[PDB]
Design a protein around this ligand. Structure first.
Ligand SMILES: Cc1cc2nc3c(=O)[nH]c(=O)nc-3n(C[C@H](O)[C@H](O)[C@H](O)COP(=O)(O)OP(=O)(O)OC[C@H]3O[C@@H](n4cnc5c(N)ncnc54)[C@H](O)[C@@H]3O)c2cc1C
Length: 456
DNA sequence: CGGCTCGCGCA
DNA sequence: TGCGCGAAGCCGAT
């Protein structure tokens, strides 16, 4: 649908129709940014061809009640900044509260929209809302993958068993799909308060807040400033100060050598494609660059692959057959310890390294990547059953990670507990052939005592 | 058949 | 710390 720097393979039709006479509406969901946003760029291009303005609509759902203030504030502060950015480009934004299935349909009717565009998420609930909207509108409806460098449905047509099978397919398509972004052109044709939504939601969540004994909150909000501008600064300092040592130190949780981009990536406050462009152009240790690109291209995009092609991505049934057979055989094994959700949540296990990982999670909202593996694997080892382990890990990941409620989290938990995108290892009690990680193993790789002391 | 994102013994 | 091996099941290139 027109454009020159616009690859049509990024866009797909959800519903055909007579293009209406009214504005193009971008139903923003996953990609909460004005810059480097293929969904917003395609929306603007369609609007230009039809000689109509583009408007942005965002629907605040009751979903926020299932997480905490830490995510709600991060997201909403981002959106306050986004509202201003879009304003400068003469793009109005509308913030709706309620079920997207109902509210988006109504908005399209009331505002006499000509075309509807949304960004891409493989999570189940987004597909449900889309199907509801389709039944409620008579205008064309498109979806743009603004989150992946290679559109999810282009990179592969099936569930990929392993990174080693996906890697060649993805890297083959980078020359086509890794490109610079055109600038967002302001609107030429002229056309609820977020402050109030924020106060109302916070009041609702205050009773569920994570607290220490003295009733002082556990969460430290100053580690990550929200919004598009801050995200760019974190990217720049990563490339300048941390990228060089990333390959060597990414698996040492006592060193702050990660990008720290995940909260921003999760809410779409920065484009993965932008990050890849800048890292590609940086002159740094080649090994570090390859390690980083493999994480933000292969592992991030295969997580969308996993959720898109396996709608039971958060269930035991999505595990590979060998892992299901192994875990099933060990269901009756005596566990060395059994903890409840509440005991894991409070960091009251016998294992100080596990407890310190959980304390980093509670206090910062971002557990170091290496201890996330250890953390999830011990939940399998010290729970009543594989289903209960899965349920506990997802519950804590999604409640406390700023970057949670994400394909990466479901794929990472499924790797840790069910061997998805892994292979079988030595046979053990309880965990069977699922890859094992030990306290002693961690001791030989990094200064465990220092991580424990940092987080009590 | 070859090669896949641990623990372990050994410089 | 850095290396090379062991223990495991399967994909996919033929
Ligand atoms: C049990 C478990 C739970 C996880 N929970 C989440 C989660 O809720 N949300 C989430 O986005 N990631 C999650 N991760 C994946 C990974 O730990 C985080 O993306 C990463 O630690 C975020 O830190 P960073 O951006 O500073 O990392 P960097 O090392 O700088 O990583 C760069 C980027 O690469 C991608 N990436 C890196 N590691 C992985 C990985 N294992 N899998 C997928 N993509 C990866 C992410 O987009 C990440 O932000 C989880 C992993 C596991 C094993």
């Amino acid at each position: 649908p027109r454009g020159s720097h616009m690859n049509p393979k990024r866009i797909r039709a959800l519903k055909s129709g007579k293009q209406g006479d009214g504005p193009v509406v971008y139903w923003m969901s996953r990609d909460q940014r004005a810059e480097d946003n293929w969904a917003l760029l395609f929306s603007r291009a369609i609007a230009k061809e039809a000689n109509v303005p583009v408007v942005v609509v965002f629907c605040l759902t009751d979903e926020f009640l299932e997480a905490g203030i830490r995510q709600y504030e991060f997201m909403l502060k981002g959106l306050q900044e986004l509202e201003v950015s879009l304003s400068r480009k003469k793009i109005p934004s509308f913030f709706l509260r309620g079920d997207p299935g109902e509210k988006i349909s109504r908005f399209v009717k009331d505002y006499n929209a000509g075309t509807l565009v949304t960004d891409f998420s493989p999570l189940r609930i987004k597909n449900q809302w889309i199907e509801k909207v389709i039944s409620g509108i008579s205008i064309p409806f498109f979806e743009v993958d603004a989150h992946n460098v290679v559109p999810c449905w282009e990179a592969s047509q099936k569930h990929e068993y392993a990174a080693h099978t996906f890697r060649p397919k993805l890297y083959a398509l980078l020359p086509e799909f890794l490109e610079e972004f055109p600038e967002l052109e302001p609107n030429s044709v002229t056309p609820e308060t977020l402050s109030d939504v924020l106060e109302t939601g916070v009041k609702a969540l205050l009773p569920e807040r994570a607290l220490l004994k003295n009733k002082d909150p556990l969460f430290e909000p100053w580690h990550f400033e929200p919004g598009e501008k801050a995200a760019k600064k974190v990217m720049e300092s990563f490339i300048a100060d941390r990228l060089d040592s990333y390959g060597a130190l990414r698996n040492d949780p006592t060193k702050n050598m990660l990008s720290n981009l995940s909260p921003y990536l999760h809410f779409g406050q920065i484009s993965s494609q932008r990050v890849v462009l800048e890292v590609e152009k940086a002159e740094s240790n080649p090994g570090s660059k390859k390690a980083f690109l493999d994480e933000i291209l292969i592992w991030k995009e295969i997580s969308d692959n996993f959720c898109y092609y396996n709608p039971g991505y958060d269930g035991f049934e999505s595990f590979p057959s060998w892992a299901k057979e192994s875990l099933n055989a060990h269901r009756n094994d005596v566990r060395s310890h059994i903890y409840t959700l509440e005991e894991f949540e409070a960091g009251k296990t016998h294992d100080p390294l596990w407890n310190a990982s959980q304390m980093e999670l509670l206090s910062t909202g971002k557990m170091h990547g290496y201890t996330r593996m250890y953390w999830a694997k011990k939940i399998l080892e010290w729970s009543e059953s594989p289903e209960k382990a899965l349920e506990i890990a997802i519950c804590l990941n999604d409640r406390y990670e700023l970057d949670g409620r994400d394909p990466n989290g479901y794929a990472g938990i499924a790797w840790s507990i069910g061997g998805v995108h892994d292979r079988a290892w030595g046979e053990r009690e309880v965990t069977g052939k699922i890859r094992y990680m030990s306290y002693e193993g961690c001791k030989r790789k990094f200064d465990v005592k220092l991580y424990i002391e940092k987080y009590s």
